[model samples]
Target: ATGLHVKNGRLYEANGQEFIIRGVSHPHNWYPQHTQAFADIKSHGANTVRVVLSNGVRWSKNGPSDVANVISLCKQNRLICMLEVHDTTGYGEQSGASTLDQAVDYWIELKSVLQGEEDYVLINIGNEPYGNDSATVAAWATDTSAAIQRLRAAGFEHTLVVDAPNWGQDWTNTMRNNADQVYASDPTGNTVFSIHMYGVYSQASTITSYLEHFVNAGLPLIIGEFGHDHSDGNPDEDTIMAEAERLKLGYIGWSWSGNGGGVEYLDMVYNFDGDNLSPWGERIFYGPNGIASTAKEAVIFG
Candidate 1:
């Protein structure tokens, strides 16, 4: 089956079932060393796992070669796989820059790998297009969508998710400009609008305001990224999650880094294992409150 449709500003399965994805994002290139990650995600009550794929990794011996196996593991564990094209290793870059043409080619290659497998996978064109205005971001979306359409014409039909401007922020303006109307007009019913919400940087009030616009405009929205820092804790988390729940929106947390060094103030599940739950293999999972406790009641994850 082709999968789902966006109706009344919500994403629904082809069978008319609504899905609220409870998930986590993991680092790119988790091939041999992080073999246990997939099993761990499933054990933690996660319905989806977002994996970042870098262009450099595709050339490496252990880069993207394991994506197929990873997708299979997600299926076996009964979890959905969201494959994000993290062309740039870290933040602070725009997808429309001429320098990113190589990255764009990498994305095309990745599409070739998973074209027809629509059941258990999703394609995120780029990680975070920070600093890019709505016009530039919409152009990237149009070009990327054109690439996806080429693949669709070639018989690949997986659902493609496109992020908004300003690192997935400022989508309200984009939608108001009808940036995503092309997908709705496309014959292949397989596209969704993706947005990221970090409470510390973006408040719940702001998110809800934008969401209200999206809902009113009848556009499907998904929180492809979300997390809170210690300084900006639980209240923000609750507000964001509550709004998402009330709207029946699907979302995935920032990450699952065991090292605890990536996003300095953001706490991952592994960071709270010692206090709330034992190192009992895969049984330990972190919740909003667990993060808040570790951060001295500064942030909430649920």
Candidate 2:
């Protein structure tokens, strides 16, 4: 009764209240020493934080000890934790990318640390699990279902979150079209679909249609990662947050800080210094219908 669950296409807490994930994404793997970010994020009225971690395939991996520390930090700050594996990002297009199976192996190895934290922790299997293409798209459902089965087989009952292909934007409608099948493949029916909104979500209509499909069909969904603007195109973050609030959906913005490779503008804070909230940070946390106005701490935190 302590773990979060999905019902009628919405996430509900152990206390039977719907829990919307009003939060920011933190690049923990790259800025491991910035543990202070956790408290800083929570102080901004965010009830959740999606943290990035590597499985040692790409970046230096965060082991069980570090992950446990992350969980402790979340609990101490009273924020719901969503831990994701970054090694699988852009699997088809990105070089040296790992598979969902390999990411599952990392989870299995950390089973001891994750076993009993279901109430406070949600596991995002792999970030941006696929890039784009017929082959990668085709393998998404099969591989994703297999990963879920593997984790369940390994005795991990925590709610599982799966990201969309096409670099988490689902530009090809791959994740959208096959979401039901992959969701049905879950034995526990606890899998939640995650979409990353970028330039593809520039139009309000586009965002509404995509988000509405899941809600209308009774599929649990969350905006796992999004940015105000991106190299792809300018995202209508106002519509993104507005629609999310209207639909009562969960959303976690892109990295809190330390974004590189021409995407530094997405950083919410400067150099992990929460005192200096960037323009993007102010818009997300202080703007209309933002986290400060919508986020409610999970009752379990009490």
Q: Which has the greatest TM-score?
A: 2
Q: List TM-score per model, in order.
A: 0.75, 0.98
lDDT tens string, model 1, 1-302? 47544555665555666555667677646334665666676665667778766666333422445776767777776677787766432223543332234455565666545755566677665565434554455555455456556656656566767665565554445533554564654466566777776532356677687666666676677778776534233325556666766776676666665534445344354542322233221111354422222111001111
lDDT of 2: 0.91
Show pairs that collide, candidate 1.
233-298, 233-299, 234-299, 234-300, 288-301, 288-302
**lDDT of candidate 2 over 149-259, digit per residue (tens):** 999888988889999999889988888999999999886888999999998999889999999999999989999988895435899999999999999999998879999
Provide the overall lDDT of each model, using Cα atoms, as 2-decimal numbers: 0.56, 0.91
* Candidate with the greatest lDDT versus the true structure: 2
- Candidate 2 contains a number of clashing pairs equal to 0
At residue 257, candidate 1 shows an lDDT of 59
| Ten contiguous residues with the weakest lDDT in model 1 | 293-302
Off by over 4 Å in 2: 230-232
Q: Candidate 1, overall lDDT?
A: 0.56
